[PDB]
Amino acid sequence: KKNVPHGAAHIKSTFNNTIVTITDPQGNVIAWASSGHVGFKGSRKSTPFAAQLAAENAARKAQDHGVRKVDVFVKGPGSGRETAIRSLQAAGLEVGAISDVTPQPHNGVRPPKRRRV
Amino acid sequence: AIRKYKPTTPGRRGASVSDFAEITRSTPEKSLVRPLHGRGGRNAHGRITTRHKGGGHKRAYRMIDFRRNDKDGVNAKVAHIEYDPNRTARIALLHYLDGEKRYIIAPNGLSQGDVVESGANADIKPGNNLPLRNIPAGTLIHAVELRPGGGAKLARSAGSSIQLLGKEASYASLRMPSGEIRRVDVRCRATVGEVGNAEQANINWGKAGRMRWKGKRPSVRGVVMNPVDHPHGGGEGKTSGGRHPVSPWGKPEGRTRNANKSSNKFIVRRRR
Amino acid sequence: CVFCAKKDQAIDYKDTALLRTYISERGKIRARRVTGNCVQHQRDIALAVKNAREVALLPFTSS
Amino acid sequence: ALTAEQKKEILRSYGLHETDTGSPEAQIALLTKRIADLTEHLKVHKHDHHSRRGLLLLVGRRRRLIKYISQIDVERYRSLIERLGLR
Amino acid sequence: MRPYEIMVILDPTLDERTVAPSLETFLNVVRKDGGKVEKVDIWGKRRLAYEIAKHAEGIYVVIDVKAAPATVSELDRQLSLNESVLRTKVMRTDK
RNA sequence: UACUAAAAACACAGGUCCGUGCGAAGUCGCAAGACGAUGUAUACGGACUGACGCCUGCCCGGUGCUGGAAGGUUAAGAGG
RNA sequence: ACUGCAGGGGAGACUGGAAUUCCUGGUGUAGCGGUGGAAUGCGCAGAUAUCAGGAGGAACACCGGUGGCGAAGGCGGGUCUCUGGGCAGUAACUGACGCUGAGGAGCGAAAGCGUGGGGAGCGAACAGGAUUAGAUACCCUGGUAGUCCACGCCGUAAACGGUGGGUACUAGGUGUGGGUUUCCUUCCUUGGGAUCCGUGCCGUAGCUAACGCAUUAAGUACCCCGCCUGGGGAGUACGGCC
C-alpha cells in the first residue's frame, strides 16, 4: 500500500540462480521475486528462461506496488542478464540507464582452490 | 627482559627471573610509603573467606596517584623507575614543578628524565593524563576510571591497554583488555600509552618455595577429599568426582554475573 | 614519449589537469603501449596517479 | 654514505702526497670508515642481509689490501696498523 | 637540511579565512627548530574524489617546509594528532 | 593418619578449561559491614592434570552448561 | 678517485583504497547455496537480496611487459629514514695489490618446530553428503593446525640454463633496457651512425649419437675447484657430526 514512482532494480545473475529485487532509490526492497520464487528448482534456476520469468514476476509485483520506472544494477557472470533486461523492458517497466556494479577486489581475499574434476 | 637460570639445582632447573634493567633507585620514597600487614585471607570475623593466602614476604605500600585531577597545567619530570611489590607493573616517581612528589604506574616507554603533562591541553604522549574527550579515537590508553573523578580502575596490570573506539555523544566506547566493549562517560580521565613490564607473564617460577614467598598457599583438589568436605570427595580408587563439576560449596559452573545489574546498559558486547 | 620529446616537463601528482590523461573512464591507468610513452615516464606517470589517488585528487574506482 | 667532503677529510688525513686516493693507505682508511659506519647501521636493522653481504665484501677487500701493504712494506704496515686498529 | 613539500587537508567545517593562523603554529615549530618556510599557498575549498571521514569537501594547503627530517616528522605527527586535519602527505622535492 | 599405616598417598613448578568489567565473581554475615585488594583480565576465584620430551584419536545420542524463542503447556493477578 | 645514470636490491616506521567476512539497524518474504545431477548445509525463531554505519585480518587490480633489480633464494599500494650493489664518462690516483679455492664460514623457496600475539579468506587432518561393486579420492557442504606478526630453530626443492668461476679469440641479421659520442642537427628524428654494459630470437664456421649449442657456446685454449666408473640393494645399514 505504498507509492514509489521511481526506484532501483538489482539483478544478481550467477551460475546457480538469478535474483531480481526492486527497491526505492534509497535501496529499500519492495519486491524481490527470484528464479526459485517462481516455479523452479535444481540447476534450472540458472537458466535464461528462469531468469526472464523471475524478471516478469518482479516487474508485475512492482506494477502492483506502484512503481513505473527503475534503474537497473546488474552483477555476476550469469547468462540471464540480457534476458532479464528485455523482460523488465517489455513487461511494463522502463529500465533507463544500464550499469554494471560487479565487485572488483584489488587483489584482496584469496580465491578457493581450483576444481580438479 | 627475562633472565633464565641455569640448571644448577632441581628447583632452579627451568626457572627465570626479571633482569630489572628498567629500575633505578632500588629504595622507595620515604614520604609516600604506608604500612601493610597480611591477612591470610581472613575477614573481620576472623574466618577464612579466601583460601590459599598467607605466609609471604613482608611488604610496604606505596601511594599511587590514581586520580591525577589537581595538577592540570603543571608539568612533571620523571625522576625514577622503581620496583613495587604490590602490583605487576613498575611505578614512576614524578617531581612536579610545584615541588610535590607522586607515584604513577610506569607506562611503556617512559624512561627517566621525561616530562609528563596533564589536563585538556596536554599532548598525546605516553604518560600524559587527559579526559577522554580530548583523546583522539584509536589511541591506546590505560588507567581509565569508571566515573568522573572516581579514580583509575581499568587496565592497570602489566602490559594492559585499552583502545578508544570512539565517542558518540557523551559516552566513549572502549575495547577493554578482556575483549569486552564498554561505554563510559567522556568526562572520565585516562592516561595515554600502554602499561610497561609487559614481558612479566613469561616468568617461570621454579619451585613451590617461590610461590610461598609470593604469598600463595597450597591448594588441595576436591577429588582427594572426603565427601563431608567436598562434593567431589569419596570413591575407592581415584575418581573424577561423582557428578558434574561444582565448587566446594556445590555451585555448578556457568555465568555468575548478576543478570539484571544496573550496568548492563553500558556494556555493548560481552567478552568471548 | 611526449615527455621525452618536450624536455624539462614537470610531472607532479598535484598536476591533476595533466594527470587526467593516461586514465580510462573507469579510473583505469592506461597501458604504456597505448599512451606511447617510454618505460621511465610511464612509471613516473603511474606513481603520480597513485599519489593523486592517495591524496584524493583522483578517484580509486570510478563507476 | 661517505659524502664528498667526508671522503676528502679522511683522504687528506691518511694520504701520501696531497692528492692520493688509490694507495693502500687511503683505500684501507676509507674501507675502515665504511665498515664502521655499516656496522653501526647494522646494530639497527639486524635483518639487513643484503647490506651485511656488502659489509663482508668490504671486510674482505680491506683484508686483502692490508695483506698486500704488509707484504710490500712492514714499516708502513705497522704505521697504518697503529693509526687505525688491528685485533 | 632537506627540502620537503607537505599537503594538508582540513575539515570543511572550518572557515577558509582563519586557516592560516591555525597552521601558523605548525609552521612556527619548524621555525624554532631551524627550518625555513617557502610558500604557504592555500587552495581553499575543493571537491574530493571520494568521501573522507564522512566529509565530501576539504581545504587544501601546500606548506613547502625545508627543515630537518626529525623536525618534519614531529610536524607531521602534530598535524595527524590535530583532529581538524583530514589528510597529510609529505614528499621530498629532491631525490 | 599426636598413640599399630611415611607410601606409589597429598603438595608442587608447568598445563588447559570455566567464571569475574570492579564496594567484580567467590566467601563470612539476617543486614550493615568485611576479606578478595589498598588488587583491576599479564588480575582474582573455581575445577581437573601434574617437571621435562613426543603427543593428546573418534562420538553432542544421554545428562549438564551456554545461547535462541516459532509453537505446545503452565501461577498469582485481571475478567465475571 | 671525481661527475652523471637506472632500478619490485634490502631493513624499519607511518599510512590508503577495492573486495570478502562478521556485527547493528532499516526495507522484505520463502527460499538461499551447490552440481553433470543432487544431497548434506543455511532460513522461516525472518534467510538470500538491498541500503547505511562499524569491526577485523590478509593481499595490493590498473601500471604490469617478452621489462627492471639481486650471488642465489627472491623482489611492485603510497610516503619518509637508514643502507647495499651495478653501469656510463674523465683518466684523476696506486702499481700485479689478480684468478680459483681443500677444509671453514655466511646467506638460503615452500613445508615443519619452540615461545607470545593474531586469525578475514583459504585450507592438510577430521566430519557429513554424492559417485562407484568398493571411494579411506577426484565433486559438494563444513571445518583444525597452518598460511600472518616478533625472535629463534631447521638448511631441505625439477634450489634448472638439468650447462662451476675467470680470461682471450671466432660471420652476420633482427627486438628491448641503461649510458656516452661526433656526424646526418633539423633529414624533429628524438630517427640513423660509433662505443660500453646486459637482456631475447634467428642464423656462419665449428662441436655433437642426435636433439641441439652457436659471441649470453654445448666452438677454439689456458688456470682453479666439484663430480662418475653397469642396474637394484641405497643415498639405505653401522659408526660419527649437527
Ligand SMILES: [Mg+2]
Ligand atoms: Mg569478633
Ligand SMILES: [Mg+2]
Ligand atoms: Mg586458589
Ligand SMILES: [Mg+2]
Ligand atoms: Mg593440587
Ligand SMILES: [Mg+2]
Ligand atoms: Mg582420602
Ligand SMILES: [Mg+2]
Ligand atoms: Mg573437618
Ligand SMILES: [Mg+2]
Ligand atoms: Mg555432600
Ligand SMILES: [Mg+2]
Ligand atoms: Mg577417591
Ligand SMILES: [Mg+2]
Ligand atoms: Mg577404580
Ligand SMILES: [Mg+2]
Ligand atoms: Mg577429570
Ligand SMILES: [Mg+2]
Ligand atoms: Mg563424588
Ligand SMILES: [Mg+2]
Ligand atoms: Mg600412627
Ligand SMILES: [Mg+2]
Ligand atoms: Mg610408623
Ligand SMILES: [Mg+2]
Ligand atoms: Mg618418608
Ligand SMILES: [Mg+2]
Ligand atoms: Mg596424604
Ligand SMILES: [Mg+2]
Ligand atoms: Mg558480591
Ligand SMILES: [Mg+2]
Ligand atoms: Mg580466562
